[PDB]
Design a protein around this motif. Structure first.
Motif, short mmCIF file in Angstrom:
data_model
loop_
_atom_site.label_atom_id
_atom_site.label_comp_id
_atom_site.label_asym_id
_atom_site.label_seq_id
_atom_site.Cartn_x
_atom_site.Cartn_y
_atom_site.Cartn_z
N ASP A 89 0.86 -1.17 0.00
CA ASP A 89 0.00 0.00 0.00
C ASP A 89 0.90 1.22 0.00
O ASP A 89 1.95 1.22 0.64
CB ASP A 89 -0.91 0.04 1.22
CG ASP A 89 -2.04 -0.95 1.14
OD1 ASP A 89 -3.08 -0.62 0.53
OD2 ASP A 89 -1.89 -2.06 1.69
N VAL A 90 0.49 2.25 -0.73
CA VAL A 90 1.23 3.51 -0.77
C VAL A 90 0.52 4.49 0.15
O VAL A 90 -0.67 4.78 -0.03
CB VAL A 90 1.34 4.06 -2.20
CG1 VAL A 90 2.27 5.26 -2.22
CG2 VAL A 90 1.84 2.97 -3.13
N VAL A 91 1.24 5.01 1.14
CA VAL A 91 0.67 5.89 2.15
C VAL A 91 1.46 7.18 2.19
O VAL A 91 2.69 7.16 2.31
CB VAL A 91 0.65 5.22 3.54
CG1 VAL A 91 0.01 6.16 4.55
CG2 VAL A 91 -0.09 3.90 3.47
N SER A 92 0.76 8.30 2.12
CA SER A 92 1.38 9.61 2.18
C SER A 92 1.41 10.13 3.60
O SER A 92 0.42 10.02 4.33
CB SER A 92 0.64 10.61 1.29
OG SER A 92 0.84 11.92 1.79
N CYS A 93 2.54 10.71 3.99
CA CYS A 93 2.73 11.28 5.31
C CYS A 93 2.08 10.39 6.36
O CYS A 93 1.25 10.85 7.15
CB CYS A 93 2.14 12.70 5.38
SG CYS A 93 2.42 13.58 6.94
N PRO A 94 2.43 9.10 6.39
CA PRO A 94 1.77 8.18 7.32
C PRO A 94 1.94 8.60 8.77
O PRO A 94 2.87 9.31 9.14
CB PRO A 94 2.47 6.84 7.05
CG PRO A 94 3.80 7.22 6.51
CD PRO A 94 3.55 8.46 5.69
N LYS A 95 0.98 8.15 9.59
CA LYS A 95 1.00 8.37 11.03
C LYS A 95 0.47 9.75 11.41
O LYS A 95 -0.14 9.92 12.47
CB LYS A 95 2.41 8.17 11.59
CG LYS A 95 2.51 8.39 13.10
CD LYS A 95 1.55 7.47 13.84
CE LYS A 95 0.69 8.25 14.82
NZ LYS A 95 1.51 8.93 15.86
N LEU A 96 0.70 10.74 10.55
CA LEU A 96 0.35 12.11 10.87
C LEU A 96 -1.16 12.31 10.81
O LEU A 96 -1.93 11.41 10.46
CB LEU A 96 1.07 13.08 9.93
N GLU A 97 -1.59 13.53 11.16
CA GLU A 97 -3.02 13.83 11.22
C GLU A 97 -3.67 13.71 9.84
O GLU A 97 -4.77 13.15 9.72
CB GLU A 97 -3.23 15.23 11.79
CG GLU A 97 -4.58 15.85 11.47
CD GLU A 97 -4.46 17.09 10.60
OE1 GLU A 97 -5.51 17.69 10.27
OE2 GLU A 97 -3.32 17.46 10.24
N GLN A 98 -3.02 14.21 8.81
CA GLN A 98 -3.59 14.21 7.46
C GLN A 98 -2.95 13.11 6.61
O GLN A 98 -2.37 13.34 5.54
CB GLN A 98 -3.44 15.59 6.82
CG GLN A 98 -4.34 16.63 7.47
CD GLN A 98 -3.97 18.06 7.12
OE1 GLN A 98 -3.33 18.31 6.10
NE2 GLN A 98 -4.37 19.00 7.97
N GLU A 99 -3.08 11.89 7.11
CA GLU A 99 -2.62 10.70 6.41
C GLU A 99 -3.59 10.31 5.30
O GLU A 99 -4.81 10.50 5.42
CB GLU A 99 -2.46 9.54 7.39
CG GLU A 99 -2.11 8.22 6.75
CD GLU A 99 -2.40 7.06 7.67
OE1 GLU A 99 -3.58 6.65 7.75
OE2 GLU A 99 -1.45 6.57 8.32
N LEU A 100 -3.05 9.76 4.22
CA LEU A 100 -3.86 9.47 3.03
C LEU A 100 -3.24 8.34 2.24
O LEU A 100 -2.07 8.43 1.83
CB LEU A 100 -3.97 10.73 2.16
CG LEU A 100 -4.65 10.56 0.80
CD1 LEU A 100 -6.16 10.75 0.91
CD2 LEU A 100 -4.05 11.52 -0.22
N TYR A 101 -4.01 7.28 2.00
CA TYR A 101 -3.60 6.23 1.07
C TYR A 101 -3.69 6.73 -0.36
O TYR A 101 -4.58 7.50 -0.73
CB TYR A 101 -4.48 4.99 1.23
CG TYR A 101 -4.16 4.16 2.45
CD1 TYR A 101 -4.29 4.69 3.72
CD2 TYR A 101 -3.75 2.83 2.32
CE1 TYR A 101 -4.01 3.92 4.84
CE2 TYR A 101 -3.46 2.06 3.44
CZ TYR A 101 -3.60 2.62 4.70
OH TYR A 101 -3.32 1.86 5.82
N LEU A 102 -2.76 6.27 -1.19
CA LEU A 102 -2.60 6.77 -2.55
C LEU A 102 -2.91 5.68 -3.57
O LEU A 102 -2.63 4.50 -3.35
CB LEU A 102 -1.18 7.31 -2.80
CG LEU A 102 -0.83 8.74 -2.35
CD1 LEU A 102 -1.12 8.96 -0.88
CD2 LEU A 102 0.63 9.02 -2.66
#
Ligand SMILES: O=C(O)c1ccc(NC(=O)c2cccc(CC3CCCCC3)n2)c(Nc2ccc(F)cc2)c1
Length: 190
Positions: free
Chosen positions: A9-22
């Motif tokens: 899975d590709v995850v942007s800025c993981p763990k943070l408040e504004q996390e988003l799968y790509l």
């Protein structure tokens, strides 16, 4: 000396408040990745256990092969695989290779960290990817990670990867340094 393989899975800025799968196609222009990225646990930076050996776009998604090389981690995991009722509880009874089964069960997810898709619209300044994490939770598009002692056996386990794709993946794996990979920073909480 363990290998790990699977679709990520590709995850942007993981763990943070504004996390988003790509969506995989949001980053496929920046694949393949042949330089080693750290392999950590659950996006925690002090838990490097190994190094990626290649990230390749493939029909069906983005495939990761990696090497688990931390002596501290391998010793801890193998000890638990042989002596811990808790570690073995969710695994089939009396498995032949307990360490491989325990990792396959407890860390099934491969998660590739990337920069935010807003940076991906137009020419990123720096590295698009930061690390791949072995994860207990959060698997969606990725497959269940496969752990083995030889990279060929690992890649073979994925029927969704053709003979050609498997040959390409394995080409770059063997060209990678194994004893030359830096020592990961994982320390055993025991
Ligand atoms: O601060 C604490 O005291 C503390 C407390 C709990 C911890 N972990 C979990 O709850 C946990 C949950 C799911 C999966 C895993 C990975 C592990 C599963 C067993 C075989 C090796 C892989 N760990 C950790 N992290 C941990 C790191 C590696 C490891 F081998 C065991 C635990 C630390």
């Amino acid at each position: 000396g363990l290998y790990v393989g699977g679709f990520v899975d590709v995850v942007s800025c993981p763990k943070l408040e504004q996390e988003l799968y790509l969506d995989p196609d949001q980053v496929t222009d920046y694949l393949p990745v042949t330089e080693p990225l750290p392999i950590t646990i659950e996006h925690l930076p002090e838990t490097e256990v190994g190094w990626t050996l290649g990230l390749f776009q493939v029909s069906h998604g983005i495939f990761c092969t990696g090497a688990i090389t931390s002596p501290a981690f391998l010793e801890l995991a193998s000890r638990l695989a042989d002596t811990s009722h808790v570690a073995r509880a969710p695994v089939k009874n009396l498995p032949k290779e307990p360490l491989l089964e325990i990792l396959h069960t407890w860390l099934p997810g491969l998660s590739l960290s990337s920069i935010h898709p807003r940076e991906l619209s137009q020419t990123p300044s720096g590295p698009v990817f930061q690390h791949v994490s072995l994860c207990a939770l959060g698997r969606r598009r990725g497959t269940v990670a496969v752990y083995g002692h030889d990279a060929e056996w690992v890649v073979s386990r994925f029927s969704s990867v053709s003979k050609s794709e498997r040959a390409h993946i394995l080409q770059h794996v063997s060209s990678c340094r194994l004893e030359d990979l830096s020592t990961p920073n994982f320390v055993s909480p025991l």
